[PDB]
Homo-oligomer: A and B are copies of this chain.
Amino acid sequence: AARSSIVLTDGTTPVTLTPVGGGVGQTLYRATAEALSAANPSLSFGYRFTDGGTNRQSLSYKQPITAVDSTTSETLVRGQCVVDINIVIPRVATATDRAEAIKRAFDVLNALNAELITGEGQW
Contact = CB atoms under 8 A, between A and B. Distances in A.
B32 A122 contact: no
Interface string A61-87: 101010111111111101111111111
A104 B114 CA distance: 16
B79 A20 contact: no
B37 A123 contact: no
Interface in A74-123: 74-76, 78-109, 111-112, 114-123
Given A90-B81, A101-B83, A121 B2 contact: yes
Contacts of A123: 1-5, 18-23, 27-28
B98 A117 contact: yes
A96 B9 CA distance: 14
B82 A85 contact: no
A91 B21 contact: no
